[PDB]
Design a protein around this nucleic acid. Sequence first.
RNA 1: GAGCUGUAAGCAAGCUUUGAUCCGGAGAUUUCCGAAUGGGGAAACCCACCACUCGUAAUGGAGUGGUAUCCAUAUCUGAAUUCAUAGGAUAUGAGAAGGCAGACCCGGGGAACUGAAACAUCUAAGUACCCGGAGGAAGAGAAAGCAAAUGCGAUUCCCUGAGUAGCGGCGAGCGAAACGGGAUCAGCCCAAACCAAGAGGCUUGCCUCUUGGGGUUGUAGGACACUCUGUACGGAGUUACAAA
RNA 2: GUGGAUCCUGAGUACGGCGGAACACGUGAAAUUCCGUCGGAAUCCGGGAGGACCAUCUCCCAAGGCUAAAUACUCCCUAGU
RNA 3: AAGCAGAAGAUGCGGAGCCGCAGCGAAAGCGAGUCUGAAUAGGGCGCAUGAGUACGUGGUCGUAGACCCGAAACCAGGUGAUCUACCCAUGUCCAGGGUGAAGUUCAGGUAACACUGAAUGGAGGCCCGAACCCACGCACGUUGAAAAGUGCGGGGAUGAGGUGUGGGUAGGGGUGAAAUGCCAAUCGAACCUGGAGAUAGCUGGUUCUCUCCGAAAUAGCUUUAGGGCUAGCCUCAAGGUAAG
RNA 4: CGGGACCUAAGCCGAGGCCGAAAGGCGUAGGCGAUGGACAACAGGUUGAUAUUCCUGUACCACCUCCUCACCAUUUGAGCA
RNA 5: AGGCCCAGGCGACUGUUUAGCAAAAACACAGGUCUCUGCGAAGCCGUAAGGCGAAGUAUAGGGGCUGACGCCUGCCCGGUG
RNA 6: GAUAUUGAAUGUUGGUACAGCUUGUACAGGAUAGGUAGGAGCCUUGGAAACCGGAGCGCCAGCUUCGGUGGAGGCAUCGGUGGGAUACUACCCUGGCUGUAUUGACCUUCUAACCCGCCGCCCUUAUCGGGCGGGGAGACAGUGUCAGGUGGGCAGUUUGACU
RNA 7: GCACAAGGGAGCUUGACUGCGAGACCUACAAGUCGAGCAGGGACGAAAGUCGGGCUUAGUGAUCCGGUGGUUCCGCAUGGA
Lengths: 58, 149
Amino acid sequence: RKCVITGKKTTAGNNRSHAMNASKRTWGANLQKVRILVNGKPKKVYVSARALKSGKVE
Amino acid sequence: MKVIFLQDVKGKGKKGEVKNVADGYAHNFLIKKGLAVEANASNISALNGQKQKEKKEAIAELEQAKSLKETLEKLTVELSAKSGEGGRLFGSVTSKQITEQLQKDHNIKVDKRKLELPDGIRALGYTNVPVKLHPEVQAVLKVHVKEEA
RNA sequence: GAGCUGUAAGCAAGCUUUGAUCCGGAGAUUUCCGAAUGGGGAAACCCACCACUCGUAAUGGAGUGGUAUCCAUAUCUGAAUUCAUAGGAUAUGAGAAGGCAGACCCGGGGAACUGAAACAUCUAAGUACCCGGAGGAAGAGAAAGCAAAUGCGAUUCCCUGAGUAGCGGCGAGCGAAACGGGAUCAGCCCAAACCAAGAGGCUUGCCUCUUGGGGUUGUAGGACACUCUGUACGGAGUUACAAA
RNA sequence: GUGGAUCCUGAGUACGGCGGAACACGUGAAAUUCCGUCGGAAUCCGGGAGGACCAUCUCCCAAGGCUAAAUACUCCCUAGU
RNA sequence: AAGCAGAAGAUGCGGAGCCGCAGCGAAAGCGAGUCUGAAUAGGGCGCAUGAGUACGUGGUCGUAGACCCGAAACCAGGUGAUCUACCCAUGUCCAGGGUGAAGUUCAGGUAACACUGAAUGGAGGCCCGAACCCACGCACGUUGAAAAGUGCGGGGAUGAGGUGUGGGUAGGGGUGAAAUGCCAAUCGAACCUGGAGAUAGCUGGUUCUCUCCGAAAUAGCUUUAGGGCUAGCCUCAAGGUAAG
RNA sequence: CGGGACCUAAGCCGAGGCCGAAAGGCGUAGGCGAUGGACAACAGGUUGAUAUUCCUGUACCACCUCCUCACCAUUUGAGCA
RNA sequence: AGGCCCAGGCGACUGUUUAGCAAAAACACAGGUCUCUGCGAAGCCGUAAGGCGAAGUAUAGGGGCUGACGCCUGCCCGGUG
RNA sequence: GAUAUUGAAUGUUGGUACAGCUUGUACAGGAUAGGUAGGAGCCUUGGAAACCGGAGCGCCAGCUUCGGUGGAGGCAUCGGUGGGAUACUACCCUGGCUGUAUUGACCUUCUAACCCGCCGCCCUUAUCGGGCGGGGAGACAGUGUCAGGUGGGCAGUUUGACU
RNA sequence: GCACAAGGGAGCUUGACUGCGAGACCUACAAGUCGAGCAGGGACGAAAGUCGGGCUUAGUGAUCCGGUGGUUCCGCAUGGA
């Protein structure tokens, strides 16, 4: 599931609701199936939404 | 919000906008296959050259217009008689050729497509004025005269 | 340096002062299962293929080696497509998969009983447990460090500070740090401006590709320029200190 | 070493909003540090820290990588208690 | 104190610290006085009325399994549908005797049909009744032949059937023609290993002797009323003294 | 004869791959797997035993040519398929 | 290798159910009805991928309620969905 | 829902920035004149006062806008019983309006991201997966944070004592 | 308990007070109750004197957490917050 361009990973967190109890909840990273270039020629690889902005050309 | 189209396409910019442009619009379309843009230092200055290169060409063109100006004025009197005759008229045809071709009477050559004279020149022999019109940016001055033979 | 043929003490047939039996170093052989890895498999088994060899009139069969996968470096090929690429083939690989000191410490997952005379914030706890990692130590480490004057000059651990400073249904409980005293005491490089070499997109120009020099500091250091001094018989080195 | 006329000294980073964890500190007057999610700086006349924050002042150059020893623990080989 | 020496011993050496020597106020501060207050007023506290410190023994209080015995149950990590609940796939089992439907045929019969009578036909969670599957009667059994069976009766017995073999569904779950049933002779949440020496106002048990003194079951409260904390009553020691 | 040098079902494993904090989960190609399909030996005798295995008779399947005959054809191609 | 004749309640029946106290007036069934679902499904098993439904397609599937058949199934939408 | 992924236009509209014009009307000047730095000047047959209508403004007093006519002029400042003060030139503003200039909402439509338990081809003998074209979808969906709801459906617990 | 009125009527009026307080009662504690008198400034009355809320005894409750005023207190280097 991890993107190659960067080291983003799922990280577990907690839902600190009002009168925090508080319930557990994992936090997955944002991802896109838009094509990226590895050994020629695509496809295909997932990419983080942050890395997708500017940077490497699609 | 910073790119360099250069190849304007309905966008509020041509030759590449150097000021706040659209964003996220290019991440997937404009940049890919379209007109790459990265208005980031590296790519910027490089565009400069072209813009940079034609800043050198600007010099070139401007001065083409104004080298050539100045180059032809002190010219020796153009002595190209246009067959002055007919009890006081002429025989030679005064239009485009003798006007421009009056320069290679020694060597230099020009292009007949630069003459500036609305009305055709009355087939006289007097001080045929020739306002050389090389380019809009730069005009010149030439003369023509007819003699008897 | 005189007995030995293990337990086993009783039984047969043998080895040795041209020196065994024994103790140690360096080896050899090392069946089959087992990460297993030629294929399959119900662990201790079956079935093969490719070369060499034995044998058979010949088939069948028997021994010796190779043939798991992924990854890495290579060498040739090659789909829609023309190039190309995917893919495929082959070669080179004491690589990697595994096991375990029930220990110690890092990272990622992670409770509940209990305490709070109940229980829901908290306590238990980041403890048990799971996984990923390692190493004989790891982590940390050479200042965006503490600190408040005649200031101290990397971390780690120990003693203190102190059960103090504080946090906390401020309940229950949790719990520092600096200074000071000790243990052990070494500090350096990579990126980046600039020079040189190779290429290559491109409009001469030009901006990045790669390989070595250059240079790694904060009352700021370096590139650049200008001075000298060196390329040694000096210094350092396999544990950081560049690599060995 | 002498000079400070020109260039560098670590970018989607440093920080900030939101949402959590870790710092003895339980989100409050609160750092700091590490995460996700969005915004996003100067670059030497620069930047950060000094327990909100601001000015002054005092110290330090973060966003790169190395580090033995002091320290912890034994399934085990010796000897001794 | 750690630590540096020193049979892992003592003794050394190290004064980092700790406590005491005089406090008061929240602090600012002041000082044998300080605070509250306009207060050289009053009062609280401390003075005046001066002993601690470091170890050893013991009484005990705290943090830890903390005095032993005992939970039902919670959480985490594993193991099992070789019984049983169901599913899947492939085989196999059902002695015989009755009932008679659809349909079909031949005659009666119609314009054709309907309809009528015989023959033919063999369906059915059909009937009777053994293997088998069950489990309603009673009795015998209950330190039984047996942790559920036997003896005599009974129901189904061609199907919603019996059954073999192999495989699947795993515990905050599966499965269930459903009752909280079944999941290895355990089921309102299965079994083992760990957190756990869980907790516990509740229970039982605290093992040698003598001597001296010697209670209480009341009060105030308490999510308390079969606990608890202070006062009442006890004991030891040091002082005051002769107060009762 | 039963099973393996034959096959396939339920189901399982499963190159690349699709996913998932990690561990792993899922699933092609392929393989595994009978409770099925394919498959050639039958009668008497024998021991204190084991016999559609040993033995006396007759057989059957598959494969291989130092062999024996018969029929053919040399890419106009007999045949293996 | 059947004891029958009756009269009523309940349950259509066969079947199934607490193995190991209760087999039934219980469960289930065909039928009846409501509601949801247009396929990449509603419902689900799963963090996901995959799969069931389904090699299905509103005369098909999921869920609730009621129980063969006959006569029927009245009124009320204020409140709660 | 917003946001991030996250497109291009149009339509509307907002926000601003700009240009310009007109508007600002207090005894008083003389009125029913925004002020301010300049300016001692005017302006007028490049047809003036005047009127006439269109036109807007408004303190409906007045101002202005234009043009018709007209036909030769209007002023002020100044002296003035008002805080200024005007022939005016400069500046910038008060209201208003118009464009311009940009954006963000709407507004549609498309369409290159994205999306296909869609079709063909190739990987490849393979309904996996993927390439590759085609097609539909589409700036959503899905997912990522973040927030509000519904929610025993799944958990952690309480529900006193005297008697 | 009170007509030596504390019971009723009028005048002046806010002691319905600031700091306190020698000593006692109440007694697990927390808390509760009275108080002569000192001083600061006052009200009434000529003075003497009396007034620290009601004839007395009930009419209300912690701590923690925050809000609002008064503050020659502190305020993580120095100045403020």
